[PDB]
Amino acid sequence: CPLMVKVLDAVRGSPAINVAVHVFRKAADDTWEPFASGKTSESGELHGLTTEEEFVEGIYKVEIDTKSYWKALGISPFHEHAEVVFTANDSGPRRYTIAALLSPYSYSTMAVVTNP
Amino acid sequence: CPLMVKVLDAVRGSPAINVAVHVFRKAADDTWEPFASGKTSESGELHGLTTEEEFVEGIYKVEIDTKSYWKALGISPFHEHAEVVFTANDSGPRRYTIAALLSPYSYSTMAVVTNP
Amino acid sequence: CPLMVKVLDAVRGSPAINVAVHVFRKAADDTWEPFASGKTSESGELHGLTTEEEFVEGIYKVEIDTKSYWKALGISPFHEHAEVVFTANDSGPRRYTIAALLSPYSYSTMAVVTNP
Amino acid sequence: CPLMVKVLDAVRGSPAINVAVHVFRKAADDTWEPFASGKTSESGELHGLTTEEEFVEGIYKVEIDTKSYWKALGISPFHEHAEVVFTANDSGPRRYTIAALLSPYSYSTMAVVTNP
């Protein structure tokens, strides 16, 4: 698992469950092409997005559909979504965890990049 | 201002100075049209991006060019940029302060919305 | 001010108004002596806590009474308070802005330190 | 494991390893008594602090020695430590994860409270 996404809810102190996440890779013509997607699990996690073979160096965008999440809870949110845009770099073996901490009018995102 | 951006540097404990910011507005054909741009001042603030008249209802994207900021300080950061996407003015004119707190592998963004 | 505190509410997208703040300074016997206190204004800001003369070198604690804030808005929050503990002025007088961004189960705090 | 602490480093995009953590419980005389302590693992995690039997309702403080961590990396930090103060509440079965995201001049903390 080279790429994992974790989403947490700072209003309820809980994982953010059933949040849609879309991953895109930047193509040669500068457009964002779909790469992977899914919904966070009961633990707020989305695993199984990609494989080492597929996850080549490039610019990726992770879009987290925060608005739908807050609307399902009845809470008016600020953002349309949260976006995390980054370059994947081969620099020895690497695993990326993209975490997002959600509030209605704020989010924080962190990247944890480790070498198994 | 109807729209102000504030950027802080969590490594130095200081405003993030000379940070480029680009604002886009979603057009009718679903593309991102350039709306306004500028650079943060010595206070980390960017004022004067738009006017009440020009800042109509819409979906806006504020793109903060964090990678360029970090690289100039000798840090190879994770993100390409910090992006903030939001519907504005859809219940009438509001004032928006978009704040970002930057670290090399993390950022936080908060919006303060006020009714004039 | 040599010391200013700013508190924001990430649920409402607004300043956190009427938030009690208590400042303490570590005394020679290792106890926390009361130093200054106040409440945030309608801008979420608390000014006028101390003076350059009184704000000597020391270890200071800024305690932000977040639980009381949340409870008054109908939220049962996680934290008792947000605490910020720091050495101040140990290479001469500085100005400190202590910012806090509040959610019910999370907060962020950032310090901006400037040399007058 | 009713109580777990996770510490992340936002400057390096990594777990924060070998960080000292101390847990205290508030005693009847309002003083903080040592409860549990340890050092974060290679994954930034500290497990095994307490047991269900021991971890009774009360006010707890988790102190994370951030200053020592940044000093070991050569990075000048703002905070003496990070503190997380909270009430444990029996409200059905409960597990607490206290996460901290560290930068030199900022930290964020989040509590994830779940029911196995």
Side-chain angles (χ1 to χ4, degrees), chain A residues 5 53 82 99 107 114-115:
Chain A
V5 174
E53 159 194 274
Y107 68 83
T114 56
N115 178 348

Side-chain angles (χ1 to χ4, degrees), chain C residues 32 59 61 67 78-87 96 98 105-113, chain D residues 26 32 59 61 67 78-81 83-87 96 98 105-113:
Chain C
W32 291 115
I59 298 172
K61 174 166 62 169
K67 183 174 180 178
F78 186 68
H79 301 94
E80 292 296 303
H81 52 234
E83 261 179 20
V84 184
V85 184
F86 63 103
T87 297
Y96 298 85
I98 306 302
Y105 281 74
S106 186
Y107 62 89
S108 296
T109 185
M110 166 62 190
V112 173
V113 183
Chain D
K26 198 150 177 159
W32 288 116
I59 304 182
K61 173 168 60 164
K67 191 180 192 181
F78 177 70
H79 304 94
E80 289 294 301
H81 54 251
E83 276 184 6
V84 180
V85 185
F86 65 96
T87 297
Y96 299 70
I98 306 300
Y105 283 74
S106 182
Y107 68 83
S108 75
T109 189
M110 161 77 184
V112 182
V113 185

Side-chain angles (χ1 to χ4, degrees), chain D residues 12-82:
Chain D
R12 305 195 294 162
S14 68
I17 304 162
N18 211 24
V19 181
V21 176
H22 293 76
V23 187
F24 304 87
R25 185 178 187 274
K26 198 150 177 159
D29 65 1
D30 274 330
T31 65
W32 288 116
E33 45 187 50
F35 181 81
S37 59
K39 294 218 101 190
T40 60
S41 73
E42 289 245 273
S43 67
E45 294 180 4
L46 179 55
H47 301 263
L49 288 165
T50 192
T51 60
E52 291 212 319
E53 159 194 274
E54 305 170 286
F55 192 56
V56 294
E57 290 185 308
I59 304 182
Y60 293 87
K61 173 168 60 164
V62 175
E63 198 150 277
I64 304 170
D65 180 5
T66 60
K67 191 180 192 181
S68 300
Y69 175 79
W70 293 118
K71 283 173 24 181
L73 294 173
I75 295 168
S76 199
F78 177 70
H79 304 94
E80 289 294 301
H81 54 251

Side-chain angles (χ1 to χ4, degrees), chain C residues 52 92-95 113-116:
Chain C
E52 190 176 306
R94 300 293 186 269
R95 312 196 186 282
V113 183
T114 64
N115 188 342

Side-chain angles (χ1 to χ4, degrees), chain B residues 10-55:
Chain B
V11 172
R12 298 206 287 183
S14 69
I17 301 171
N18 288 332
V19 178
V21 179
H22 297 254
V23 187
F24 306 84
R25 182 182 177 276
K26 199 162 262 194
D29 66 3
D30 263 7
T31 61
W32 291 115
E33 178 155 69
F35 181 80
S37 61
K39 283 185 176 198
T40 58
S41 71
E42 276 177 7
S43 69
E45 298 182 6
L46 174 53
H47 295 268
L49 282 169
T50 191
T51 61
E52 190 176 306
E53 250 179 43
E54 179 191 50
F55 195 39

Side-chain angles (χ1 to χ4, degrees), chain A:
Chain A
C1 200
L3 184 61
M4 193 266 274
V5 174
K6 188 176 178 59
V7 190
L8 296 177
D9 174 338
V11 172
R12 305 195 294 162
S14 68
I17 304 162
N18 211 24
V19 181
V21 176
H22 293 76
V23 187
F24 304 87
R25 185 178 187 274
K26 198 150 177 159
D29 65 1
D30 274 330
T31 65
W32 288 116
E33 45 187 50
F35 181 81
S37 59
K39 294 218 101 190
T40 60
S41 73
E42 289 245 273
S43 67
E45 294 180 4
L46 179 55
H47 301 263
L49 288 165
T50 192
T51 60
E52 291 212 319
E53 159 194 274
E54 305 170 286
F55 192 56
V56 294
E57 290 185 308
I59 304 182
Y60 293 87
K61 173 168 60 164
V62 175
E63 198 150 277
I64 304 170
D65 180 5
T66 60
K67 191 180 192 181
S68 300
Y69 175 79
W70 293 118
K71 283 173 24 181
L73 294 173
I75 295 168
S76 199
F78 177 70
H79 304 94
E80 289 294 301
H81 54 251
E83 276 184 6
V84 180
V85 185
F86 65 96
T87 297
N89 283 302
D90 285 351
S91 287
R94 297 296 194 183
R95 304 293 185 83
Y96 299 70
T97 296
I98 306 300
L101 181 60
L102 307 185
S103 302
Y105 283 74
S106 182
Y107 68 83
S108 75
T109 189
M110 161 77 184
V112 182
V113 185
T114 56
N115 178 348

